[PDB]
Write a protein that binds this ligand. Sequence first.
Ligand SMILES: NC(=O)c1ccc[n+]([C@@H]2O[C@H](COP(=O)([O-])OP(=O)(O)OC[C@H]3O[C@@H](n4cnc5c(N)ncnc54)[C@H](O)[C@@H]3O)[C@@H](O)[C@H]2O)c1
Ligand SMILES: NC(=O)c1ccc[n+]([C@@H]2O[C@H](COP(=O)([O-])OP(=O)(O)OC[C@H]3O[C@@H](n4cnc5c(N)ncnc54)[C@H](O)[C@@H]3O)[C@@H](O)[C@H]2O)c1
Ligand SMILES: C[C@@H](CCC(=O)O)C(=O)O
Lengths: 291, 290
Amino acid sequence: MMTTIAFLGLGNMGAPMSANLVGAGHVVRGFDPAPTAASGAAAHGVAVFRSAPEAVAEADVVITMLPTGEVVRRCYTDVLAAARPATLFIDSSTISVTDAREVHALAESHGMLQLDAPVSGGVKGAAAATLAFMVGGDESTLRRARPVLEPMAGKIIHCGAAGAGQAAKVCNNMVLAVQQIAIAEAFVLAEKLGLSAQSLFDVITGATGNCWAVHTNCPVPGPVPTSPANNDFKPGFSTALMNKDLGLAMDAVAATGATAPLGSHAADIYAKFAADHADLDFSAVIHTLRA
Amino acid sequence: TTIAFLGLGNMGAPMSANLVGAGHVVRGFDPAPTAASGAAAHGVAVFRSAPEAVAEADVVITMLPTGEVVRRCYTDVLAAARPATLFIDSSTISVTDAREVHALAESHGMLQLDAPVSGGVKGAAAATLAFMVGGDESTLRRARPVLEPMAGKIIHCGAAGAGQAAKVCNNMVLAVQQIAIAEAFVLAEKLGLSAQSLFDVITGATGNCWAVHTNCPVPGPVPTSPANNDFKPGFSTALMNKDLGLAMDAVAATGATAPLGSHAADIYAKFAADHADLDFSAVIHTLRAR
Ligand SMILES: NC(=O)c1ccc[n+]([C@@H]2O[C@H](COP(=O)([O-])OP(=O)(O)OC[C@H]3O[C@@H](n4cnc5c(N)ncnc54)[C@H](O)[C@@H]3O)[C@@H](O)[C@H]2O)c1
Ligand SMILES: NC(=O)c1ccc[n+]([C@@H]2O[C@H](COP(=O)([O-])OP(=O)(O)OC[C@H]3O[C@@H](n4cnc5c(N)ncnc54)[C@H](O)[C@@H]3O)[C@@H](O)[C@H]2O)c1
Ligand SMILES: C[C@@H](CCC(=O)O)C(=O)O
């Protein structure tokens, strides 16, 4: 065994992430207050503990993979004094840039190294060890973190100072939401103009409007058989998750005083769509555009 | 092949020169003397009226500003044309006007394509224009030898109107992507994320598109992008505003819902009132107006 890693949050992402660490030869000290999550992690080789302070107590690294910034803040407030001095904390939760910098500052005030390393790839990315880690913090701290991150990761990219990981991801996902609606709008307009879906696909994908939202995640069935449109809009990337990321994008915009017209319009659209269609893929927003 | 070329402006001139360069007999007409003179300089036999230029032609190409002008041109010249003369409209006009002129042309025993272009004056001179073609496939096959000399890319979009539909749908997406990318870069700046960091991430992730990887609206990440060169077009706000207007005509006509597309249209219409002469990526610096 190489490093002793505490993992806090063994959910849909945390469990397959923790399993890959166990496979790579690490001792993984898990905690999750949902007992079903803890059991599933235990089955794949994680040492499950009674409380989060117990898990972090004998750990060289501490990964958190949690729902929100409020949960990360409270987790940190609980566990930081329990951890040994100069333990490496890695938050791979998707939280706000304001929260990330608060919890980063908190971790350093307790004498701990701290990175924000939010991920893209979903549960499939998590299990196959192909997640993109977008890291913020010190360059030396990331260098120390790499042997832990590499067995979970397809790509590791340093974004800047603390919170830059969260900033990088939330800017990209804001763009992605806008693209996904914009592509849906185009396909529906083509439909009404008598332009075939296959033809619009071939044009856009060979021209300047090409992007992942069309080439991989095509919102009409046919042109890309692997896309969610061909499987009843089963995620994939859920509307619930995109709505959450767009909430954090709107938080970032509100915090900075920025102006993002189309990003905010996309946030308003997905917020309404999430109310009734949270369980569908975010490409399904196309359904709002048909009378 | 003898070719009538009607509209010898910024696009029509270099296109016609390329056809002369490929061994075609190009007959021309433009109501601007400077346009006609400069066309005559590179081998086009200019004529005093459009019906005159059309008379001895196997093919008739229009590169004109609007649908009203293409419609009027067609009615001025269709009687002067021989039967089975191939008409190609490379003007960018609405899908409604495109299908109207197609029907009108084929009623006179002509073969007609809509075939608008992407690539600008740069692509027109270099002969790398992307023709997106609506019409019959056998009519496109006949058109290929004429199109090849002006084109780097030729794509059959469908029946009459599909060419105009395909272009306007893609450029609507482009306008939205260009603004979305510009929002991402100023949000990143205010969050203390460098331009180069944001560029590296987005270009290797789901958000990647031409609007960032080639037309990056901040200077540095892509040295050749207009942002590094006082926002010299490139692809102007004036022309993007022109293409979005046509998208809104299409949305109005079909009764389509296109909120982001329509929002991009409003932004660029307002932006074109101040900065029509700048590249459409310059929209980044008019965001604080909203
Ligand atoms: N699933 C995806 O598609 C996806 C993709 C990218 C990013 N993310 C992000 O990853 C994060 C987690 O995602 P998930 O799908 O695993 O969420 P999840 O709800 O499945 O898992 C979160 C887990 O954290 C546990 N938890 C709560 N408080 C805790 C504490 N104090 N200590 C230890 N554990 C605690 C919960 O019981 C739960 O099991 C989220 O922030 C999400 O935005 C998810
Ligand atoms: N310039 C570009 O970057 C570009 C790129 C792609 C497509 N387009 C499209 O191509 C079309 C024309 O582009 P342009 O840049 O050459 O415009 P332009 O204004 O430079 O040229 C149009 C020419 O047509 C002439 N004209 C007007 N009425 C006429 C008639 N009845 N018969 C013959 N000629 C007539 C005008 O005098 C003018 O010289 C437009 O619809 C535009 O949207 C332009
Ligand atoms: C558009 C056509 C011709 C290209 C060219 O002439 O360079 C082709 O690519 O097949």
